[PDB]
């Protein structure tokens, strides 16, 4: 029915388990008191590469084929340079194949150095989408590579779903998962998984109000991407949801809570200060959601809530004051 | 052997406090394993109530010590510390439904007053002198039928800190060594008593800033040699010298002492923030720095499984830049 099934999530877990961390679920008395709930924190910030994206990236490297005539990917290529590019480069290195990140000439020096530092090769393009698409396609063809989208690639979605397999095992009495949403690869994989295994468990999305395409899409009942690149401290969720993740989110996600920039900032600081966990602000989105006014509408029966702390890739130098 | 505490005291402490403290997790780091050549285990006391291990000793003290009054239960706790000890004692007081008072000189920063009240201690003012601090504390202690608790020499505190090792030995059955940052040595001594009682083959190693190397010097000379002057160190939680109660334990039951430079501390702290995503305070960086240090490299390969106590996470976020 959807672009992935529970069976695909299971193949993904089999595919990646030898190379990822089964990250712990931690608790906090303080956050319990603030929210009125029994919170559990799935610590993807301690995952290899500093985010959960290694799950989808590794699955993609281990399951996609470059061509009808070649079963083994000979390189990986992506346009995404942040947590996905880092995760995809690590997956490529594990598999002994090169990684290419397609990068506009106009990217900051910092960005270019960062990519080099995580061991990928840069391929330069023009800022135009016509240029990016041409270059990424050329690279993929020349290298016999796989292009691995950060959130719409089914093997990626299936990989991200493995988080929910762990959560359900680590937290048998869980009532709800709270998941930050950008392109919805994580949200959709988790929704498929939870609704296949234990549909009484709620799946809730958390999103910056400044980038609220997932909320608007669920509100309208059709895919409504951001018209303009969003401004948010939550840099990992600036993608819009897309054609593969939207149908899953429409049908299998119970609710979407949006949060202000101030709420994201305050929740991130709270996690740093009270839990001593170096989350990136994007991972504060889910915490903000559970602290927000609208989350009080959630039935008191929904007591045990697992929030995914999705990443820890923060540049601390410039992060304190943001 | 015989010392100010025995393992029996640690067992009592565990029963006294276990219902109110976190059994903190032990985490691991692939990168740190590779950098040291060891299997490291990180006992995460930065996740403990109040943000440090000190609630163990503080709660044990609040539940064990008696005031100088009619009724056997303390009606208050009075403190000098606005740091980890003070915050831990304040929380232990809240659990027991008794006021915590902190004696503060008239001229302490308005910032630090706000911070004191943030954790719920009641400020009693004194004049800025060691005479006035002491005498106000005594008065308040007596008038409130309260108790005072030394941060590292009090036997109830030392016994409480030992509870760390009880957990570690359960959590890491094959542990070969514990690495523990040392200031006053309450934690190091409580750990040593526990380890040597339960599994004496496990090594107990102390870690300390080279800028405050009283523990190293003491062990070298075979006598208690406190720091000549108050040390300057980024490791603000280990500025105290070892005292008369912890020294004998440390002399007899601690296997070795590793010192680390300020740069080694700062670097180890940053490494933990960046690579483990754990907001340790620099004092907790001391033990990591120790296992990374050249001198530690020379330690026998049979000592494979090493548990480092990440002792606290109470760090000023804004001041994190430039440490
Ligand atoms: Ca969005
Ligand atoms: Ca010292
Ligand atoms: Mg239930
Ligand atoms: Na192809
Ligand atoms: Na499974
Ligand atoms: Na599709």
Residue numbers in the entry:
A (entry chain AAA): 4 to 325
B (entry chain CCC): 3 to 325
Authors' own words:
Human serine racemase (hSR) catalyses racemisation of L-serine to D-serine, the latter of which is a co-agonist of the NMDA subtype of glutamate receptors that are important in synaptic plasticity, learning and memory. In mammals, D-serine is synthesised by a pyridoxal-5′-phosphate (PLP)-containing enzyme serine racemase (SR). The roles of Ser 84 and Lys 56 as the Si and Re-face acid/bases in the catalytic cycle of hSR are generally accepted.
The difference between the conformations of the A- and C-subunits can be seen when there is no compound bound to either subunit. Interestingly, of the four subunits in the asymmetric unit, subunit C is locked in a slightly different open conformation. and compound 13-x0430, was only observed to bind to the C subunit.
